[PDB]
Amino acid sequence: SGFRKMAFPSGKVEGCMVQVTCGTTTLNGLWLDDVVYCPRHVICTSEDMLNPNYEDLLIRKSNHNFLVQAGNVQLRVIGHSMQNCVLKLKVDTANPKTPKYKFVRIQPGQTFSVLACYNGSPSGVYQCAMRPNFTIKGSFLNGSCGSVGFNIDYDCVSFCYMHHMELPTGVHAGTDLEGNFYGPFVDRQTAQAAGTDTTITVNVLAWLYAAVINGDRWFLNRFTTTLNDFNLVAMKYNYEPLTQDHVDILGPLSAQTGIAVLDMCASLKELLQNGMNGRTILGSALLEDEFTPFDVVRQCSGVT
Amino acid sequence: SGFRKMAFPSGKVEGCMVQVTCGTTTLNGLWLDDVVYCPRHVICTSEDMLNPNYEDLLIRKSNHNFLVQAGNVQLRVIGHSMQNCVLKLKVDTANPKTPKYKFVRIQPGQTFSVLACYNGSPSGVYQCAMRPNFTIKGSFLNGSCGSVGFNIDYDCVSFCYMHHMELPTGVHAGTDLEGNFYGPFVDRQTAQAAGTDTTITVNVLAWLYAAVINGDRWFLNRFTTTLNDFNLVAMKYNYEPLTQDHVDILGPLSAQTGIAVLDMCASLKELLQNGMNGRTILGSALLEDEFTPFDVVRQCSGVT
Ligand SMILES: O=C(Cc1cncnc1)Nc1cccc(O[C@@H]2CC(=O)N2)c1
Ligand SMILES: O=C(Cc1cncnc1)Nc1cccc(O[C@@H]2CC(=O)N2)c1
Numbered sequence: 053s054g055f056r057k058m059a060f061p062s063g064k065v066e067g068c069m070v071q072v073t074c075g076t077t078t079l080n081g082l083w084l085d086d087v088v089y090c091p092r093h094v095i096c097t098s099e100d101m102l103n104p105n106y107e108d109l110l111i112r113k114s115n116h117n118f119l120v121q122a123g124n125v126q127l128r129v130i131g132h133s134m135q136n137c138v139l140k141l142k143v144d145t146a147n148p149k150t151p152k153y154k155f156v157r158i159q160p161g162q163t164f165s166v167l168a169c170y171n172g173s174p175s176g177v178y179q180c181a182m183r184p185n186f187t188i189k190g191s192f193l194n195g196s197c198g199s200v201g202f203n204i205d206y207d208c209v210s211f212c213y214m215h216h217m218e219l220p221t222g223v224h225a226g227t228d229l230e231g232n233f234y235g236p237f238v239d240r241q242t243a244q245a246a247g248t249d250t251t252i253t254v255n256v257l258a259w260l261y262a263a264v265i266n267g268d269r270w271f272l273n274r275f276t277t278t279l280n281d282f283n284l285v286a287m288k289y290n291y292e293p294l295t296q297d298h299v300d301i302l303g304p305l306s307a308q309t310g311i312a313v314l315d316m317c318a319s320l321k322e323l324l325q326n327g328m329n330g331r332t333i334l335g336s337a338l339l340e341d342e343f344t345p346f347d348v349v350r351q352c353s354g355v356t
Numbered sequence: 357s358g359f360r361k362m363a364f365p366s367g368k369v370e371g372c373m374v375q376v377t378c379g380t381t382t383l384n385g386l387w388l389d390d391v392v393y394c395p396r397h398v399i400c401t402s403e404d405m406l407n408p409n410y411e412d413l414l415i416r417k418s419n420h421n422f423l424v425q426a427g428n429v430q431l432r433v434i435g436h437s438m439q440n441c442v443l444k445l446k447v448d449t450a451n452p453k454t455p456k457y458k459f460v461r462i463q464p465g466q467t468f469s470v471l472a473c474y475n476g477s478p479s480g481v482y483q484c485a486m487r488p489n490f491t492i493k494g495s496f497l498n499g500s501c502g503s504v505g506f507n508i509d510y511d512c513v514s515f516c517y518m519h520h521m522e523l524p525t526g527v528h529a530g531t532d533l534e535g536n537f538y539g540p541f542v543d544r545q546t547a548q549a550a551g552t553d554t555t556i557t558v559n560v561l562a563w564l565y566a567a568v569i570n571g572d573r574w575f576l577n578r579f580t581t582t583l584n585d586f587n588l589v590a591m592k593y594n595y596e597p598l599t600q601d602h603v604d605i606l607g608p609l610s611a612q613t614g615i616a617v618l619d620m621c622a623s624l625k626e627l628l629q630n631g632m633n634g635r636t637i638l639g640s641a642l643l644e645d646e647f648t649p650f651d652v653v654r655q656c657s658g659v660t
Contacts, residue, residue, distance in 0.1 A: 061370050167365060327634075
């Protein structure tokens with residue numbers, strides 16, 4: 053029993069974190085095989101950030117200008133290339149702690165763990181979700197860039213995110229491990245504002261199933277609804293529209309609890325229209341949307 | 357910017373997790389040097405749990421009855437002893453991944469990270485706090501016993517907790533690494549109920565300082581109060597009484613934000629007497645008490 057915002061064990065990813073210094077800028081890099089991945093804004097001075105032309109700035113850089121340090125030993129850079137918004141610094145040594153890995157581009161609504169790092173050293177790990185507006189609500193300070201988001205499938209690390217930016221609103225923007233930003237963000241110090249932060253409805257439902265599994269059932273009502281009726285209410289509350297794909301995805305939780313998805317939607321609908329009335333669900337006074345249906349099944353079964 | 361419930365990187369502790377099997381019971385063990393630590397209820401059958409006499413049950417056990425497995429290799433048990441509610445299984449091999457470590461007994465209010473494990477394999481990491489009633493609100497299933505709580509000071513792991521029990525109310529009980537339970541709990545399947553779960557006031561204040569540092573200032577009012585006046589209100593709301601020691605501990609956060617501790621207490625007092633009014637502080641609709649003043653300073657500065 054008990055439901056926590058659980059992050060994946062970070063050891064496999066700690067063994068991949070290095071420090072990348074280019075001139076005065078020091079940020080984090082991911083060392084997998086003989087390549088070090090890091091944000092391309094490592095080559096910028098805070099001034100360059102206003103209107104950077106990365107191909108022009110990159111000409112002035114040689115292999116010896118990138119200082120890669122793993123722990124306390126210096127890595128030799130034998131090649132460098134730009135792939136979208138990440139730099140790939142080919143080193144002469146393959147990372148002996150390189151785990152089995154993949155580079156995946158996740159969809160909004162999906163959750164992942166972030167190992168926050170500074171000077172190539174991990175300082176904390178937390179669970180995140182790619183918001184529907186392609187921002188993340190991380191916890192990052194200056195020097196955190198190059199910190200990565202990942203999922204673990206048994207022994208394989210699926211790297212999905214690398215931190216690049218903090219918007220003026222305190223939310224974060226970053227890329228996949230191919231350098232492509234999630235959303236419309238660019239690595240430039242210009243006016244970038246995030247869109248509406250809608251609630252991930254399927255994740256709220258999965259978390260409501262987790263609450264029923266854990267004993268908190270006060271919110272279960274005597275009502276049902278339809279996908280169209282629920283969506284009318286969901287749109288009014290800036291919730292993501294719910295599809296038959298999401299209903300199907302909730303199938304295992306619906307089967308385990310004996311509560312049909314549309315019944316749980318009707319419970320959600322009353323919670324939206326009436327609030328919690330000072331009550332809490334899983335120690336939370338708001339509707340939590342950072343657990344996917346897969347996360348609830350993993351945490352409620354013990355997927356190692 | 358951004359404030360997350362951050363857990364310490366778990367790698368150093370993952371390298372210490374092993375599986376301990378005694379008859380039909382399989383749980384987790386901590387392998388540090390040539391010793392494996394685990395809950396003593398590993399020797400019990402679910403029946404024995406009702407009224408166990410561990411010294412009597414232990415006589416029937418030999419070194420060869422404890423099966424210790426690290427990853428996929430079997431460890432040889434050359435000695436076994438009971439220390440309070442933990443078994444120490446001396447193995448013939450020192451753990452090559454033993455980090456620099458200490459066994460500390462934390463006080464209620466203090467926070468720590470938990471690496472939840474099953475069959476000696478870590479499956480998740482999350483941040484906890486030792487509740488003032490000596491329970492923890494973890495996320496543990498059957499087979500999680502022997503999962504440990506720790507803090508990391510640069511490269512040294514201070515192990516503070518080992519999971520042993522789940523009370524009928526869904527809260528968790530466990531010991532320090534010397535086998536002594538936090539609180540009045542015993543490793544017996546009998547009626548054990550937790551006391552009042554009071555809120556850790558100093559942690560709420562530290563989290564209010566974190567909110568001001570992160571931009572959420574709506575709750576800052578034009579009032580002040582006294583330690584006695586605040587405590588009158590705190591006791592009414594099942595908050596822990598606030599001492600000059602806690603005020604002193606909040607000193608660095610008070611200095612960084614320019615908000616005196618008693619002013620922040622008056623802000624807390626209005627939040628208690630009036631609720632959030634549908635507002636949120638750091639994305640939370642309730643007053644969070646699982647960040648110590650030290651955690652806020654660590655997260656807001658980047659202590660690796
Ligand atoms: O924010 C950081 C660094 C950092 C990261 N995380 C927390 N704190 C700091 N990097 C950065 C890089 C490039 C552009 C930029 O400005 C964009 C323009 C806009 O609206 N924000 C920012
Ligand atoms: O609860 C577990 C195992 C487990 C751990 N965590 C989640 N789920 C299961 N162990 C256990 C061991 C000894 C006594 C016991 O019962 C005490 C009596 C009472 O009120 N509870 C329980």
